[PDB]
Coordinates of C-alpha atoms and ligand atoms in Angstrom, one line a residue:
X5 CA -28.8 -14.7 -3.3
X6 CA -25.1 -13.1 -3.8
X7 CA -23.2 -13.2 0.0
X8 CA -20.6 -11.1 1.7
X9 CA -18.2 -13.5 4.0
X10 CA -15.5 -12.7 6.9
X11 CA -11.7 -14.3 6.3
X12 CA -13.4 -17.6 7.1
X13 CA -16.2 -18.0 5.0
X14 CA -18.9 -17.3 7.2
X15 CA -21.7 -14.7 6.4
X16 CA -21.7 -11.2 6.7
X17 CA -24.7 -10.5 5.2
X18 CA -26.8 -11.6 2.0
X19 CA -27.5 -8.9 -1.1
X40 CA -23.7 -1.5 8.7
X41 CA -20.0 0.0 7.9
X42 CA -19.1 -3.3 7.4
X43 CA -21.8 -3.9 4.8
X44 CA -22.0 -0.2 2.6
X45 CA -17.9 -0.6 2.4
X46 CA -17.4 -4.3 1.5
X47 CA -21.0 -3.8 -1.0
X48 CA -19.0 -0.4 -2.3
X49 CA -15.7 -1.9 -2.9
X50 CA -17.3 -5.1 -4.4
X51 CA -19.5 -3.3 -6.6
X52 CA -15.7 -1.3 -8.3
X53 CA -14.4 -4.8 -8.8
X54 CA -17.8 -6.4 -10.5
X55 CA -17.8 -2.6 -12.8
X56 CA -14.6 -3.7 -13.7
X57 CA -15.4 -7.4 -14.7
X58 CA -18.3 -5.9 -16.4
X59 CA -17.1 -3.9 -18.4
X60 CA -14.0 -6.3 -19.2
X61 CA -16.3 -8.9 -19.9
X62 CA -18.8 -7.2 -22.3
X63 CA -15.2 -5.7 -24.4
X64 CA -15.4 -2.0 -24.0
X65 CA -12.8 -0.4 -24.5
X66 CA -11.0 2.1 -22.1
X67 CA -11.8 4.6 -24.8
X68 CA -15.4 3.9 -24.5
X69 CA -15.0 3.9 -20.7
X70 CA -14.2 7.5 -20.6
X71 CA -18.1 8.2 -21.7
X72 CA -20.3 9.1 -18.2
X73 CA -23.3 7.3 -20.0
X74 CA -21.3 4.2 -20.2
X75 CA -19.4 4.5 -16.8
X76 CA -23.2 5.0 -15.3
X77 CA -25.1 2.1 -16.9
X78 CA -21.6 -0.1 -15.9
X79 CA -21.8 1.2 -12.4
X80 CA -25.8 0.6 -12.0
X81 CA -25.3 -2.8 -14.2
X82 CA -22.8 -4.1 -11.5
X83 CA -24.8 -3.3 -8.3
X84 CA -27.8 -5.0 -10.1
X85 CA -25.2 -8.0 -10.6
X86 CA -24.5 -8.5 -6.9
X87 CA -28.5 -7.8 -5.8
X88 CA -29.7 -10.4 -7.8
X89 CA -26.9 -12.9 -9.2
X90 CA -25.4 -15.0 -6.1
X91 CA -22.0 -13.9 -6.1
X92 CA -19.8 -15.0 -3.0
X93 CA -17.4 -12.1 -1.9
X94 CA -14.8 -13.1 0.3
X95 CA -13.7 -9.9 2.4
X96 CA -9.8 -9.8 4.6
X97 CA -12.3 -9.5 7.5
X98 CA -11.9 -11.1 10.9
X99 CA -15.7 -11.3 12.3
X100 CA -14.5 -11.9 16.3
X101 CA -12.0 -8.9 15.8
X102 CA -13.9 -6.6 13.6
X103 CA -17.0 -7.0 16.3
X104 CA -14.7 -6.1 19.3
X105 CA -13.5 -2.8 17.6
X106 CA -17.2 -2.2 16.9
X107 CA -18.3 -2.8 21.0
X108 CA -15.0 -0.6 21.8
X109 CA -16.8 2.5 19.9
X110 CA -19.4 2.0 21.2
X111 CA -18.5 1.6 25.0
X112 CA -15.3 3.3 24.7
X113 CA -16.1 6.3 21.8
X114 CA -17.1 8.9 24.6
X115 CA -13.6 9.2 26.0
X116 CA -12.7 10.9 22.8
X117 CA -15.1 13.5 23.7
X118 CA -13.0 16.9 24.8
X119 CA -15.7 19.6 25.1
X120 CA -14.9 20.6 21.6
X121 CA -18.8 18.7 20.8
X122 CA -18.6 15.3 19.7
X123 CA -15.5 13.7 18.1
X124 CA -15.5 11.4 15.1
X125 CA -13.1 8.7 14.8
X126 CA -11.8 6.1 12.2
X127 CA -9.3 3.3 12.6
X128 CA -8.3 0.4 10.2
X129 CA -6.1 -2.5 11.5
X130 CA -3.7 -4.3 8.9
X131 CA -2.3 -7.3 8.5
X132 CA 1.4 -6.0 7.7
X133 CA 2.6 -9.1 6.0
X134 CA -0.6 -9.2 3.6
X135 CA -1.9 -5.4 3.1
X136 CA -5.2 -7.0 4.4
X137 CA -7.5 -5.2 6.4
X138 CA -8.4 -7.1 9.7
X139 CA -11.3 -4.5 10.9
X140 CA -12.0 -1.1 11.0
X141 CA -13.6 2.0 12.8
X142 CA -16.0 3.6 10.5
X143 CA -16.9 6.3 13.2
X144 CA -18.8 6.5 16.5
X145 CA -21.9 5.4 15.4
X146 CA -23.3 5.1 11.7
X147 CA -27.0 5.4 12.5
X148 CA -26.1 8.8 13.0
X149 CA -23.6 9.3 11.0
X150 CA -22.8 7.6 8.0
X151 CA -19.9 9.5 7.0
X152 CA -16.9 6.5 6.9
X153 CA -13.9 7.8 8.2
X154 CA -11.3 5.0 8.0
X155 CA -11.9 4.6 3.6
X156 CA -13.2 7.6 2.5
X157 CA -12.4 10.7 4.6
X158 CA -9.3 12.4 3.7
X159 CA -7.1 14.3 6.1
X160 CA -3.9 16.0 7.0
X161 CA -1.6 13.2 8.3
X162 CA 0.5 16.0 10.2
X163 CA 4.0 15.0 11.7
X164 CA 3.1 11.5 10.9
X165 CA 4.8 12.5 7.5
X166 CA 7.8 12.8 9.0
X167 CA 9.0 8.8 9.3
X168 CA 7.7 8.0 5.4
X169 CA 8.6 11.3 3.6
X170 CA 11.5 13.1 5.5
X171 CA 14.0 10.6 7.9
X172 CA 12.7 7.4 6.4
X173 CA 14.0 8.6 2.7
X174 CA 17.3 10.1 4.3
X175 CA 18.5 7.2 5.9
X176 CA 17.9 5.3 2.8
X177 CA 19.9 7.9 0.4
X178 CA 22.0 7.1 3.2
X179 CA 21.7 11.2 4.0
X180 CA 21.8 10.1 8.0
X181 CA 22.1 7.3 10.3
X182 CA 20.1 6.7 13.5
X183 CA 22.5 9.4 15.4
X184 CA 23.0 12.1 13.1
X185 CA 22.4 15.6 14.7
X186 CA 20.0 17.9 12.6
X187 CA 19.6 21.7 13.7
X188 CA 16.3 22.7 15.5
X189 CA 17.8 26.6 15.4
X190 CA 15.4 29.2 14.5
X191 CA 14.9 29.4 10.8
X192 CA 11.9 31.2 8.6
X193 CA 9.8 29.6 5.7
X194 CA 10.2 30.8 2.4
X195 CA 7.8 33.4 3.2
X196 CA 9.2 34.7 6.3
X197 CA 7.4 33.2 8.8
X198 CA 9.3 31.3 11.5
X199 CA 9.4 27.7 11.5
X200 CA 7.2 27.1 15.2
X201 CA 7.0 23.9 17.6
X202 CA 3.9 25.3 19.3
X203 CA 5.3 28.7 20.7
X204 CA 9.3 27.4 20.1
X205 CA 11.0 29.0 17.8
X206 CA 13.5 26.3 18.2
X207 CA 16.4 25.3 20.0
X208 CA 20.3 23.8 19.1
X209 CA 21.4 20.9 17.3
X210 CA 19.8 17.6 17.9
X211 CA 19.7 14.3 17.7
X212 CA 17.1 12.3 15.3
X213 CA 16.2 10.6 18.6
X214 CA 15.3 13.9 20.5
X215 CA 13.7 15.7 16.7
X216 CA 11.3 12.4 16.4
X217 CA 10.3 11.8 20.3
X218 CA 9.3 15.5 20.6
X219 CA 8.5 15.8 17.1
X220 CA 10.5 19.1 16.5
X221 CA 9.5 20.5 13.4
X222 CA 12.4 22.2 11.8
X223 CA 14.8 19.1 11.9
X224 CA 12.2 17.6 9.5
X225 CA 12.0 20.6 7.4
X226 CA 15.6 20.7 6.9
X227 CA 15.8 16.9 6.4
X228 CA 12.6 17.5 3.6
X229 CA 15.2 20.9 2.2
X230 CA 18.2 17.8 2.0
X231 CA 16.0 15.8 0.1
X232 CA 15.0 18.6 -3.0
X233 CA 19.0 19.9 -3.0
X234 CA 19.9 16.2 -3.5
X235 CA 17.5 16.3 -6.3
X236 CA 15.7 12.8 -4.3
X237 CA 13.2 10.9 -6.0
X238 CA 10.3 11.4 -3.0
X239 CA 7.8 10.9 -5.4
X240 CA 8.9 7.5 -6.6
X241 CA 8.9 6.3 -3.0
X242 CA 5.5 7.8 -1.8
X243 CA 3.6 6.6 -5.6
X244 CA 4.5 3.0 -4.7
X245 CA 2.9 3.1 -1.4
X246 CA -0.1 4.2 -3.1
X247 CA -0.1 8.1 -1.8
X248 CA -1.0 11.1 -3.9
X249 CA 0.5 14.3 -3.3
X250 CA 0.1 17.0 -6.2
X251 CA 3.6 19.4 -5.4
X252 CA 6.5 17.7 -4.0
X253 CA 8.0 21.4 -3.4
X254 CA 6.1 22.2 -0.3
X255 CA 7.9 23.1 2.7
X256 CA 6.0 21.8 5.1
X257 CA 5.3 18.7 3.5
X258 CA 7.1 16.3 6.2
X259 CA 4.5 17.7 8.9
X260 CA 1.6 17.0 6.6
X261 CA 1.0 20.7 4.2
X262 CA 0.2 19.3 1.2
X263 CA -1.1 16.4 1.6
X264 CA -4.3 14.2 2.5
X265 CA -5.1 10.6 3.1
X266 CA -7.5 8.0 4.2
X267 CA -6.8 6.0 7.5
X268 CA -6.5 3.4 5.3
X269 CA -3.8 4.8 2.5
X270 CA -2.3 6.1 5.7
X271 CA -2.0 2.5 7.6
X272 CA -0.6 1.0 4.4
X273 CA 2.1 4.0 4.5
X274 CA 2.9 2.2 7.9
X275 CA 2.7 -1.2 7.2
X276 CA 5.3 -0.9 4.9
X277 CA 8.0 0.7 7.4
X278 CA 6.3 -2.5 10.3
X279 CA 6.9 -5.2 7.4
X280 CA 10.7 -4.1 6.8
X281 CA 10.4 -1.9 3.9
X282 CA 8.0 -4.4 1.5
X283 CA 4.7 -2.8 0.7
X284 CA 1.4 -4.5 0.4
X285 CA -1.2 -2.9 -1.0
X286 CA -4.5 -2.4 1.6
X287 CA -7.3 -4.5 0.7
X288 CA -10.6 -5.0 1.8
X289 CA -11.5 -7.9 -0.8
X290 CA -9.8 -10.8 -1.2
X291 CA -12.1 -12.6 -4.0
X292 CA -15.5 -12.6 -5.9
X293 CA -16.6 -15.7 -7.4
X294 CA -20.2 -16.2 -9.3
X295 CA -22.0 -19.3 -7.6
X296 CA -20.8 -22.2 -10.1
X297 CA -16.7 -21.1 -9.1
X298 CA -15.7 -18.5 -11.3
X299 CA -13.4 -16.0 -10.8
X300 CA -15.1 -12.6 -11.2
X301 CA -11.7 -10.6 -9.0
X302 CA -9.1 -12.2 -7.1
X303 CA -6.5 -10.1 -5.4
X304 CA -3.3 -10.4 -6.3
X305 CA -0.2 -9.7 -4.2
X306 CA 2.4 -7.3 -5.4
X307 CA 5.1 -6.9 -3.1
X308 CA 7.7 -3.7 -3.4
X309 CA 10.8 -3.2 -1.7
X310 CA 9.9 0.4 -0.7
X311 CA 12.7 0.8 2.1
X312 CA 16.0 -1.1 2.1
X313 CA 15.6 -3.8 5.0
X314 CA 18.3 -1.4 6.9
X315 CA 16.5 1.6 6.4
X316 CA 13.0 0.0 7.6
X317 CA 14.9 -1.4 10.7
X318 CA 16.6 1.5 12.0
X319 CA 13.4 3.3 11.5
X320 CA 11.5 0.4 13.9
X321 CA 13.6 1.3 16.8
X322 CA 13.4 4.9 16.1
X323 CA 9.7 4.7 16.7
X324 CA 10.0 2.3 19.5
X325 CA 11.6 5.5 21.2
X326 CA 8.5 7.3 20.2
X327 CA 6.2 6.1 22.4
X328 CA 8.5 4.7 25.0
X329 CA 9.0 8.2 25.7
X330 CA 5.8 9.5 26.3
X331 CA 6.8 13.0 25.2
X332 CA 3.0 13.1 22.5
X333 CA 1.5 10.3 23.6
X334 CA 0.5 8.4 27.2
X335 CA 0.2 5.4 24.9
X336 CA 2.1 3.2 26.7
X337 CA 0.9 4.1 30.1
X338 CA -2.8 3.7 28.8
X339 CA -2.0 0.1 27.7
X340 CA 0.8 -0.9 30.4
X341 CA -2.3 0.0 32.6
X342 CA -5.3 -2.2 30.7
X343 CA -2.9 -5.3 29.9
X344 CA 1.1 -5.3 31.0
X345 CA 1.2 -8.4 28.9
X346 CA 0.2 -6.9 25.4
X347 CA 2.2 -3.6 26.9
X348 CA 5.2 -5.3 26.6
X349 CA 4.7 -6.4 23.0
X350 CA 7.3 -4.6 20.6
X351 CA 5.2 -1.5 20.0
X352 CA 6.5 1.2 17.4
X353 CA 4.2 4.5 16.5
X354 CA 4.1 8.0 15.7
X355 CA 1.3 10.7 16.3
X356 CA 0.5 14.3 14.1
X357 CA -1.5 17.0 15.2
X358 CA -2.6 19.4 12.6
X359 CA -2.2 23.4 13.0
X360 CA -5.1 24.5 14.5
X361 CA -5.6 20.8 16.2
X362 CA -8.3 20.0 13.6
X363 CA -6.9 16.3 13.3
X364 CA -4.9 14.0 15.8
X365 CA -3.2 10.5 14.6
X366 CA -1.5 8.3 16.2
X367 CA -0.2 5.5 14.1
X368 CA 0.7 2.0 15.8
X369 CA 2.8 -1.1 14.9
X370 CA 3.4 -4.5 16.3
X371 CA 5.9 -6.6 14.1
X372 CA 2.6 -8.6 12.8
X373 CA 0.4 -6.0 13.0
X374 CA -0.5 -1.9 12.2
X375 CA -3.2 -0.1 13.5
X376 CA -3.6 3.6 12.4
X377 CA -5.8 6.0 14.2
X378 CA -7.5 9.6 13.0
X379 CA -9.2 11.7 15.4
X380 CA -11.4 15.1 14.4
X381 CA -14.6 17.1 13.6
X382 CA -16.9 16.9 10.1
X383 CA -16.9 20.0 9.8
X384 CA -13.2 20.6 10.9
X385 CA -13.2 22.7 13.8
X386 CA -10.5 22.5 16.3
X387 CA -10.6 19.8 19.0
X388 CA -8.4 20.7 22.6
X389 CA -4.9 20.8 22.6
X390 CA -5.0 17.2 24.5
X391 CA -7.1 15.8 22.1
X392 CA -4.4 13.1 20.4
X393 CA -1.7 13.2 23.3
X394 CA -4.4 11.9 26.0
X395 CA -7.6 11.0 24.5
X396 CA -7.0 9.6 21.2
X397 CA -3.7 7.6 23.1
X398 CA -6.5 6.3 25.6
X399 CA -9.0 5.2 23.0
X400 CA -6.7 3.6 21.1
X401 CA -5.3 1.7 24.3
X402 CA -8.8 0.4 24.8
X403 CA -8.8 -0.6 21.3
X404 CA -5.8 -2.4 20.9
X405 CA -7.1 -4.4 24.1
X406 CA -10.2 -5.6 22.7
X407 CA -8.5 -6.2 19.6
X408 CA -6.0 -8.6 21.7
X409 CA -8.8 -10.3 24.1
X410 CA -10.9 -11.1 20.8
X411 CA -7.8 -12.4 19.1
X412 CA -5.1 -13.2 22.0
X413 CA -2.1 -14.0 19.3
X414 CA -2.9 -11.6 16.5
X415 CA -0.4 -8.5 17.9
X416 CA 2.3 -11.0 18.4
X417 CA 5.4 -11.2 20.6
X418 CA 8.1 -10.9 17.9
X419 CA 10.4 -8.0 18.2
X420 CA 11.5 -6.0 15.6
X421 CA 15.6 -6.5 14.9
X422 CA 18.4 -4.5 13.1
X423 CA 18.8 -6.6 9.8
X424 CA 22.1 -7.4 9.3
X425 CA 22.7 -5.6 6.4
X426 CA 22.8 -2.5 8.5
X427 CA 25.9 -0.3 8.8
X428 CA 26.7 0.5 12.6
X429 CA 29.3 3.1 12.9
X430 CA 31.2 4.5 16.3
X431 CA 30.9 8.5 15.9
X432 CA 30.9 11.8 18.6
X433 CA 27.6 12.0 20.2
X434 CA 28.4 15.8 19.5
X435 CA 28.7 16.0 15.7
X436 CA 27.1 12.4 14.7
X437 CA 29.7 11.7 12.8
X438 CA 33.4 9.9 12.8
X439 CA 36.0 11.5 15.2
X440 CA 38.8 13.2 13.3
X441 CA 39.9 16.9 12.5
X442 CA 38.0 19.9 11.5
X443 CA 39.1 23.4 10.6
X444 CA 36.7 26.3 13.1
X445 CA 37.7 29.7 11.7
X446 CA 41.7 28.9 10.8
X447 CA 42.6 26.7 13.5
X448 CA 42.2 23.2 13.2
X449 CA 40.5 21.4 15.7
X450 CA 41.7 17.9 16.6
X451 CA 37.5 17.0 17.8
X452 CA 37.4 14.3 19.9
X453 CA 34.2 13.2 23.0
X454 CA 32.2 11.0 24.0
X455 CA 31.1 8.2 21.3
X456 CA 27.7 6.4 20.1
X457 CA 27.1 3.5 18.0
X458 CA 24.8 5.1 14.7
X459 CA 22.9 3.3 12.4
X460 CA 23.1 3.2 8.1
X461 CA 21.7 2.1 5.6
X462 CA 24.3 2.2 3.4
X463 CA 27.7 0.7 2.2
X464 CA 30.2 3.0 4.4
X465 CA 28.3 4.1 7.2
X466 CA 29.2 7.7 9.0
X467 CA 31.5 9.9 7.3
X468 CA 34.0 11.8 9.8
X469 CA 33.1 15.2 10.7
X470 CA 32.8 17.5 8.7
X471 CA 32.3 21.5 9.7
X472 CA 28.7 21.3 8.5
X473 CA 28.3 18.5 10.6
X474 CA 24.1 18.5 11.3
X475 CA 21.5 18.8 8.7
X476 CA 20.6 22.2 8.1
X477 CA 21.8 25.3 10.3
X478 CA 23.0 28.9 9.1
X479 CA 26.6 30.0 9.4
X480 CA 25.5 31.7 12.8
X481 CA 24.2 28.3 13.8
X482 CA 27.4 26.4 13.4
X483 CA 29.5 29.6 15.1
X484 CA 27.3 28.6 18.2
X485 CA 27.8 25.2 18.0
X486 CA 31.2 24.7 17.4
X487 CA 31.6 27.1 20.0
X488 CA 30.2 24.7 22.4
X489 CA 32.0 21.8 21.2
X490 CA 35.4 23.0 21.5
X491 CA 34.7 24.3 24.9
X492 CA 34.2 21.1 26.4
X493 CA 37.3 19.1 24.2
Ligands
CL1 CL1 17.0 -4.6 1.2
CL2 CL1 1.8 9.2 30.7

């Protein structure tokens, strides 16, 4: 009799998300074995006939051959997310009908997955909505794809203004934050707290100009995006992920810039001690430490804000204690509130959370800001009274490699002089310490100060600016 174990080494089950995933993601590694084993080449792997005898010959391996797979599962932990959908699952409920739900926790200095939320309840409906559903990501984009790959071009610093003026997409829509057509110049602070969308447009528009490699960074996190040209592509057009792809995504930014890849297997042995699969680490420096860093108290702000998410009141409420751990997050609603995330990190640990309908029809308006924050609240407490030391109470720090520079809260960059139609401006204000990622730091001011804005744009701005010298 083959046997699928927690972390520990204690039974799952002999050869029910727990079981079909594990089983499912066992039987790929035993294929690959398999076929290894028995010399066929990748050539003759490309044959259906052969793939399908290979996939029925490894399920048939584990039914009847005593294998011992060892899963990245925590039994105590994976059981309380399981009672917290079940007790707790109904407060997602919004009067849209019933709302499915899928979370994965992660381990972010291993990739390993802890326990997951496969949906409300599998008996009555299977669908697995933490590993194999696939979904808009939304605004949650914006940290990984848009100001995360800035700051490391070392494009911006924590305090760099970008503009949220009124702007059109290539085919002449406007650029909208629900029914705003947008605003002034902003901080990255303000743009990420409220999740302003054309400051990430612009910061995506920065990146293609600069001819950025996007690709390169997003392919080593595991993410698969077939064209990098969209414009919307920082709030999610484009692009579709698991809750697992997704939590790797933000593991990587929680575990300073070094991706892990996700796993749900750590090892498959046959009963005398052979190695059938063994996972094997491979760390990549996705981020710079800096970059990562600055980006961790970026998204400190997020939530500490409460501008998308009642996150932290939800938890301060539950358990003060595990409230004042050094929470980071991010949430994403989709355009016609078809999917909510919200995406959480403690230094030790990320938890990543989806929200949305089968059949993709729109949930309320509130659905992610107050529900979905709720949930996950309740979540992240079980997780913490089942495992009282697994969230941690490390912070997350500045490395010291990163680049503080003193600049005008105005412009986001150096103080200095400027030339504004003729006249040169000696631009002076009040000051802020910003944060880089690279060697330098802030330039000085330049007229094009923000990223993105028209001519008309800057007119206004600098209009402003001068006015108050
Ligand atoms: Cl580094
Ligand atoms: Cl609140």
């Amino acid at each position: 009799i083959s046997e699928i174990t927690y972390s520990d080494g204690t039974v799952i089950a002999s050869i029910d998300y727990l079981y079909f995933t594990t089983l499912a993601e066992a039987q790929e590694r035993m294929y690959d074995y398999l076929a290894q084993r028995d010399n066929v080449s990748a050539k003759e792997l490309k044959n259906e006939a052969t793939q399908k005898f290979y996939r029925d010959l490894a399920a048939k391996e584990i039914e009847n051959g005593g294998y011992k797979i060892t899963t990245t599962i925590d039994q105590k932990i994976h059981s309380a997310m399981q009672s917290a959908v079940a007790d707790y699952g109904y407060l997602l409920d919004d009067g849209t009908g019933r709302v499915e739900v899928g979370n994965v926790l992660m381990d972010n200095q291993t990739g390993a997955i802890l326990g997951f939320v496969g949906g409300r309840n599998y008996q009555e409906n299977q669908n697995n909505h933490a590993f194999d559903t696939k979904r808009s990501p939304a605004s949650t984009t914006k940290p990984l794809l848009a100001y995360g790959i800035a700051i490391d071009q070392g494009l911006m610093g924590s305090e760099t203004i970008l503009s949220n003026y009124p702007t059109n997409f290539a085919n002449g829509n406007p650029i909208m934050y629900a029914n705003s057509k947008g605003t002034g110049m902003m901080t990255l602070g303000e743009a990420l707290n409220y999740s302003w969308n054309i400051p990430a447009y612009w910061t995506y528009r920065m990146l293609r100009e600069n001819g950025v490699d996007v690709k390169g960074y997003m392919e080593k996190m595991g993410y698969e995006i077939p064209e990098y040209g969209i414009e919307s592509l920082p709030m999610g057009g484009g692009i579709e992920v698991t809750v697992a792809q997704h939590t790797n995504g933000y593991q990587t930014l929680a575990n300073n810039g070094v991706y892990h890849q996700k796993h749900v297997i750590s090892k498959i042995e046959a009963a005398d001690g052979r190695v059938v699969y063994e996972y094997q680490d491979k760390p990549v420096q996705v981020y710079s430490k800096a970059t990562a860093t600055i980006m961790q108290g970026l998204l400190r702000e997020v939530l500490s804000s409460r501008v998308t998410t009642t996150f932290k009141s939800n938890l301060t409420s539950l358990n003060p204690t595990l409230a004042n751990a050094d929470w980071i997050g991010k949430t994403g609603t989709t355009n016609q509130d078809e999917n909510m995330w919200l995406m959480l990190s403690t230094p030790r640990l990320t938890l990543g959370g989806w929200i949305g309908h089968d059949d993709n029809h729109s949930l309320s308006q509130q659905a992610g800001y107050s529900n979905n924050s709720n949930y996950m609240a309740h979540l992240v407490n079980a997780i913490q009274q089942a495992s009282p030391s697994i969230w941690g109470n490390e912070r997350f720090a500045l490395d010291p490699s990163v680049v503080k520079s003193e600049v005008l809260k105005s412009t986001g960059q150096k103080p200095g002089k400027v030339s504004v139609e003729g006249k040169e401006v000696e631009v002076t204000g009040s000051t802020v310490t910003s944060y880089w990622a690279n060697k330098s730091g802030a330039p000085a001011t330049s007229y094009r100060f923000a990223i993105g804005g028209s001519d008309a744009d800057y007119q206004n701005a600098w209009s402003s600016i001068v006015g108050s010298l």
